[PDB]
Design a protein around this nucleic acid. Structure first.
Lengths: 49, 38, 114, 726
RNA sequence: CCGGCGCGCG
């Protein structure tokens, strides 16, 4: 009670590198989808990736 | 058998082994997937 | 058994012509509207409220410009929403109001000009 | 329902009309209006039915979609059954049209069988009238049970699961709790029943240039839902190419893809398309875990209408639809002007037609909840047909109002909010913030204070009103699955107070957010505080992050700063820690060390409360056969000591506590009477040494199977065999 | 003071 821990929107801390890592995964998914459409990989390879 | 089936395909269904000009990526996919997964 | 949800009646150019030509006892309010016009929804609700207000003391009609485009152009309609307040006395001149005018403005026009 | 949210009772309304249209003729291979009024049928316990010419009586459905039999409101719910077995394209929905017409098939092979159908059929249920929310959601349920349907034991484990054909037709969140989980469904907001018994949802068609396509909103049966590429994303994305090859998530062939816009056929554009009414009343639902969304929907159905109601500062915009479709408020049936208003009636006159509308005044529901109506119009006001005239219970200004906006802090307070307990202020008690009227019925002078203590309000059947203020042990909950029991009530000088000096009304444990994973309550409390200072209300459609990233955060933070700046209250928005502020201990005047998230959320009072659960028993009436104490609070029965409780006592080794609750507290007739006598004189209780009436009962039953069971005692002294009387 | 059906709570 004396310290009175609480919980706000600001306290929910995402790690600083999430935007970096999500962008890289989006770039790799975009490249493989195009080459899957080209016929350079098959469906299971795209599904696994 | 796989000598009369091909002839039947050619005669009745218009089959012909037209050349598929592939990119290096598609050529690699065809030549490398014949060996295994990884 | 079931009351109608809308009191404002939609008229053709010929029907409105006959209405204006014929003898009138109460003021006639003519609305020009199009269903693709965004402001015409608010004007539709406002004129429904006005029709509820003036039970038999006024006549509220609407003309669609998608069916009477040439008639609207003839009557000097430059845009939507456009209202025409026609007095029962043929000697007087009608009033054209342009824009989403307030309900009190329509009440004032009907009371003090028709 | 192409351009607006359809009426929540439109499925029942359309089904009954279809039954009158073709169901009557198809089975007879002329109806007169009922003589009794709808109010008279329930007042003196009749059935609202119309005469068929004299073949019988056909019950009539109310405009709200509920029948009246013997003065009891009843609802006919829909059923799902076999037409990929779990695909919705292999199912059919049987509405009230199919159930009423089918009974006509049995009737003609009327009055009695229809009377027995509503009484006995599982698909016919008593309407829940706890609050306006319960009245409408009951009629939109979908069941796999019922005649011709699977039982819980019969239910396959692959059923009860979410199928992709359910999207837009069956809510993936709403389901029953317990053994019947996954077997009781619920229709979506925009769902519709098609002509083949299938459920349909509207989708927006994107079509090429050379096509008229007058109406681009078309409904899909689940059979044709597969073969369309349906996208839920938006078109706010541009690169150095053009808009058509921007990629969006989409649905196709039971799986999720990511394809270009030029390959998309249909778009899901309605905000409330995939949810039911319960899940559509949760603001910021996209920040709550879906597990708590199911519980939040259930809790909203247990909210008690309060003696005074108020609107929520933060809502979703579906409250107005719920109020209109519940029938609780008074809706004009004719345009005109208001001439007279009072408690008992409202007089409306229009187009030479003057009507008198009676108003409900302190009436009882099936759940012992009060109903009341107050005028919402003044004399001399023009009214359109279909506009509100009066406000009912749990309804303010034409919106559903199940709770109150109270000042709230999220911090631990001396263990009085341990686990899920709630600490409240005395202001909520003497302010009558959470006071509700409750009325029972019993089959005495009017206006007498009987002593179940209450005031007799109506005699016909005795109705007793009970004014119930909030108390310790009562249950309160928010709209985000955050439930709690009130464990402590403090004076206002003891509660923590803000930098403006105002004490808070409730204190919540902050530990309940991370484990429960409902962040939407933090968003709502902060915005509720901002709206109260700015004199604003917010009706926010769910999934606002479709516009931009962190859309809810931008809306709440910017509205918090606007309230702080306009009212000159710098604690309302703190740049260091937005949403949190330092508050002070009401007992010491010293600030708490960490800033506390504060706000004004919407908290409800639930039916589950004390005065309906506290039970006590000394002795009394026992069962006729087993001679054990009765079961149930209403029967003044006792508590059962089950076999799991017996294991615990055996684990403790308390062999004499176990024998107490096995012989002379349950069924030893001789030893029950002596325990009553010894305890009053305090003269030591001896061992029973005989058999309880449950063992003697078993012996006689075994005798009826030609089996003899004898109990013998062999003396360890002289080895004499003693036959015990049994 | 008996059983079925429906709805709930932990």
């Amino acid at each position: 009670t004396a310290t009175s821990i609480s919980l706000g929107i600001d306290d929910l801390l995402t790690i600083p590198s999430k935007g970096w890592l999500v962008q890289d995964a989006e770039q790799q998914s975009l490249i493989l989808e195009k080459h899957h459409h080209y016929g350079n990989v098959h469906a299971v390879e795209k599904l696994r990736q | 058998t796989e000598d009369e089936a091909r002839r039947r395909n050619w005669i009745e269904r218009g089959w012909a082994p037209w050349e598929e000009i592939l990119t290096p990526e598609a050529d690699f996919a065809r030549k490398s997937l014949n060996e295994g997964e990884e | 058994f079931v009351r109608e949800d809308y009191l404002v009646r939609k008229l053709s150019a010929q029907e409105l012509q006959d209405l204006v030509k014929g003898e009138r006892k109460v003021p006639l309010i003519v609305d020009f509207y199009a269903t693709w016009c965004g402001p015409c929804i608010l004007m539709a609700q406002e004129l429904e409220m006005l029709a509820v207000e003036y039970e038999s003391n006024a006549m509220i009609v609407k003309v669609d410009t998608d069916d009477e485009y040439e008639f609207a152009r003839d009557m000097q309609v430059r845009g939507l929403p456009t209202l025409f307040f026609i007095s029962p006395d043929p000697s007087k001149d009608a009033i054209r109001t342009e824009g989403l005018i307030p309900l009190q403005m329509m009440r004032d026009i009907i009371d003090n000009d028709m | 329902g192409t351009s607006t949210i359809p009426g929540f009772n439109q499925i029942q309304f359309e089904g009954f009309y279809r039954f009158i249209d073709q169901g009557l003729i198809e089975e007879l291979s002329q109806l007169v209006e009922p003589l009794i009024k709808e109010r008279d049928a329930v007042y003196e316990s009749l059935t609202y039915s119309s005469e068929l010419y004299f073949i019988g009586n056909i019950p009539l459905m109310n405009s709200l979609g509920t029948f009246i039999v013997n003065g009891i409101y009843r609802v006919v719910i829909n059923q799902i059954l076999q037409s990929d077995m779990n695909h919705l394209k292999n199912k059919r929905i049987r509405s009230v049209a199919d159930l009423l017409q089918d009974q006509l098939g049995l009737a003609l092979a009327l009055t009695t069988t229809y009377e027995s159908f509503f009484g006995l059929h599982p698909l016919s249920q008593v309407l829940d009238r706890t609050n306006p929310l319960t009245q409408i959601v009951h009629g939109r349920k979908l069941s796999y049970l019922g005649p011709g349907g699977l039982t819980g034991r019969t239910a396959n484990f692959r059923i009860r699961d979410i199928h992709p054909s359910h999207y837009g037709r069956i809510c993936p969140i709403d389901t029953s709790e317990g053994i019947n989980v996954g077997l009781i469904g619920s229709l979506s907001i925009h769902a519709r029943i098609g002509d083949w018994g299938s459920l349909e949802s509207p989708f927006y068609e994107l079509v090429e240039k050379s096509k008229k396509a007058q109406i681009r909103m078309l409904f899909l049966s689940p059979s044709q839902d597969e073969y369309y590429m349906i996208a839920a994303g938006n078109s706010l994305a541009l690169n150095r190419g053009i808009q058509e090859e921007q990629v969006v998530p989409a649905r196709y062939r039971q799986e999720f893809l990511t394809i270009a816009w030029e390959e998309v056929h249909l778009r899901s554009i309605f905000p409330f398309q995939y949810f039911s009414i319960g899940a559509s009343l949760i603001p910021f639902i996209e920040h709550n875990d879906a597990n708590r969304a199911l519980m939040s929907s259930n809790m909203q159905r247990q909210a008690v209408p309060l003696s005074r109601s108020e609107k929520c500062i933060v809502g979703t915009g579906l409250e107005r639809q719920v109020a209109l479709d519940s029938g609780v408020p008074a809706i004009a049936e004719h345009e005109g002007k208001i001439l007279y208003t009072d408690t008992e009636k409202i007089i409306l006159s229009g187009n030479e037609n003057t009507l008198s509308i009676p108003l409900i005044m302190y009436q009882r529901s099936n759940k012992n909840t009060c109903m009341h109506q107050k005028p919402q119009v003044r004399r001399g006001k023009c009214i359109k047909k279909g506009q509100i005239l009066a406000d009912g219970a749990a309804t303010v200004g034409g919106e559903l109002a199940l709770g109150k906006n109270v000042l709230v802090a999220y911090m631990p307070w001396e263990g009085y909010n341990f686990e899920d307990a709630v600490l409240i202020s005395e202001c909520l008690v003497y302010g009558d913030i959470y006071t509700s009227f409750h009325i029972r019925k019993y089959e005495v002078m009017l206006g007498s204070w009987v002593e179940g203590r209450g005031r007799v309000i109506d005699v016909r059947r005795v109705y007793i009103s009970q004014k119930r203020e909030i108390k310790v042990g009562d249950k309160v909950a928010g709209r985000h699955g955050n439930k709690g029991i009130i464990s402590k009530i403090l004076p206002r000088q003891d509660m923590p107070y803000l930098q403006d000096g105002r004490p808070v009304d409730m204190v919540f444990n902050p530990l309940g957010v991370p484990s429960r994973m409902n962040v939407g309550q933090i968003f709502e409390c902060s915005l509720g505080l901002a709206g109260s200072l700015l004199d604003r209300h917010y009706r926010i459609a769910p999934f606002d992050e479709r516009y931009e990233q962190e859309a809810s955060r931008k809306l709440v933070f910017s509205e918090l700063y606007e309230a702080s700046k306009q009212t000159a209250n710098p604690w309302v928005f703190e740049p260091e820690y937005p949403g949190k502020s330092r508050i002070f201990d009401g007992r010491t005047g010293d600030p708490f060390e960490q800033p506390v998230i504060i706000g004004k959320p919407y908290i409800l009072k639930l039916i589950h409360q004390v005065d309906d659960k506290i039970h006590g028993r000394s002795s009394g009436h026992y069962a006729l056969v087993t001679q054990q104490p009765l079961r149930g609070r209403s029967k003044q029965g006792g508590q059962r000591v089950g076999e799991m409780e017996v294991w615990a006592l055996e684990g403790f080794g308390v062999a004499h506590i176990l024998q107490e609750m096995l012989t002379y507290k349950s069924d030893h007739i001789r030893a029950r009477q002596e325990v009553l006598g010894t305890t009053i004189i305090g003269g030591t209780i001896p061992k029973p040494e005989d058999a309880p009436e449950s063992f003697r009962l078993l012996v006689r039953e075994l005798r009826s199977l030609a089996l003899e069971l004898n109990h013998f005692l062999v003396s360890e002294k002289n080895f004499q065999i003693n036959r015990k009387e049994v």
